[PDB]
Design a protein around this ligand. Structure first.
Ligand SMILES: O=C(NO)c1ccc(CN(Cc2nnnn2Cc2ccccc2)C(=O)c2ccccc2C(F)(F)F)cc1
Ligand SMILES: [K+]
Ligand SMILES: [K+]
Ligand SMILES: [Zn+2]
Length: 357
């Protein structure tokens, strides 16, 4: 009946040498951690230590070339750090970035291990830099290594190769890297909700559309729920969970749930444009706790309003600890385009999931 928590201030050391106001700030994690103290949640959790992922562990999802290049940045001079970062889509690199990315991944490995050994029931990981845009062979979108994807493979490496892992990605952006890593895999079900705007929203690829259902034996195991033309919030996320996420997840019957928990869909975010409330995130967390014998690991991804992410993630930890879940209005009408999105995903995935037929 225990909730784990991992946070290590060393992950603040990754920083933008050329724009100290870049939104992926060191204080994202320290603000969330401080809010857990203010709300007296920290002392209710079992503290799980951070550790470095090993290069062998990184190779569970990433190419040797990509690992080597990011590793090479540890000792680079500033001009070379600037040039390397510019080779990617939306990446800044400091001499601490590689080690911080290793700590983010290793923290989540230790948390998954604590869950799978039964030392804790569930856990929260207050880590940065984020991971879900990172691909097998490249960094992208503030992300170096795909922490959630690596954690799924790490869990499989200690319990069972075919362990059924559900990754729910509620960051406002599509986790292109996670989708691609598992696109042909039926042991890892990837479900993403994300702003799409017909491809106008970052990362600006049709890979995020509802018709990308997976490949080969992975067909049906990639669920994209894309939002267009509306300021989405609690009603739309609750509806997507009710009609799509939970029916599919229950049929898949995961043995471990990882949440790619960005908080950039939150009210107040400078980028997301959405209005999911802390109660909304608590509702989603509580729903996921009904799966996988409660084995849920919440992993910080994006989210850029420091006050919003601190309150939102803290409310998720409150749910993991067993606090009473919020009651929300399931009768509020959805934005009209959200109904269209949900119907498009249902049509795309009904061939693969009997719960949708
Ligand atoms: O959260 C996240 N992943 O989970 C996440 C990951 C990466 C970005 C990067 N990015 C893309 C972006 N987003 N909103 N417009 N564009 C630019 C665009 C213009 C015209 C057509 C298409 C795209 C930045 O543009 C960017 C780059 C450096 C510093 C600050 C920013 C910010 F977004 F804040 F302004 C954003 C979010
Ligand atoms: K997402
Ligand atoms: K998959
Ligand atoms: Zn995001």
């Amino acid at each position: 009946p225990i909730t784990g928590l991992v946070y290590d201030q060393r992950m603040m050391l990754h920083h933008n040498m050329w724009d100290s106001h870049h939104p992926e700030l060191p204080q994202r994690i320290s603000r969330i951690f401080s809010r857990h103290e203010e709300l007296r949640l920290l002392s209710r959790c079992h503290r799980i230590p951070a550790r470095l992922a090993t290069e062998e562990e990184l190779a569970l999802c990433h190419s040797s070339k990509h690992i080597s290049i990011i590793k090479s940045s540890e000792h680079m001079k500033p001009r070379d750090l600037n040039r390397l970062g510019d080779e990617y889509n939306s990446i800044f690199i400091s001499n601490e970035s590689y080690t911080c990315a290793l700590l983010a991944a290793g923290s989540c490995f230790n948390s998954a291990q604590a869950i799978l050994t039964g030392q804790v029931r569930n856990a929260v990981a207050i880590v940065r830099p984020p991971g879900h845009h990172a691909e097998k062979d490249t960094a992208c979108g503030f992300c170096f290594f795909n922490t959630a994807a690596l954690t799924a493979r790490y869990a499989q490496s200690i319990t069972r190769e075919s362990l059924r892992v559900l990754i729910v990605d509620w960051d406002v952006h599509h986790g292109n890297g996670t989708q691609h890593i598992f696109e042909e895999d039926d042991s890892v079900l990837y479900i993403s909700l994300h702003r799409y705007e017909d491809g106008a929203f970052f990362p600006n690829s049709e890979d995020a559309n509802y018709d990308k259902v997976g490949l080969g034996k992975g067909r049906g195991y990639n669920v994209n729920i894309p939002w267009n033309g509306g300021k989405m919030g609690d009603p739309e996320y609750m509806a997507a969970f009710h009609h799509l996420v939970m029916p599919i997840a229950r049929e898949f019957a995961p043995e471990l749930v990882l949440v790619s928990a960005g908080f950039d869909a939150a009210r107040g975010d400078p980028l997301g444009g959405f209005q999911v409330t802390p109660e909304g995130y608590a509702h989603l967390t509580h729903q996921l706790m009904s799966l996988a014998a409660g084995r849920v690991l919440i992993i910080l991804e994006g989210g850029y309003n420091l006050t919003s992410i601190s309150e939102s993630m803290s409310m998720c930890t409150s749910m993991l600890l067993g606090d009473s879940p919020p009651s929300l209005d399931h009768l509020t009408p959805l934005k009209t385009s959200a109904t269209v999105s949900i119907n498009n995903v249902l049509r795309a995935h009904a061939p693969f999931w009997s719960s949708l037929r």
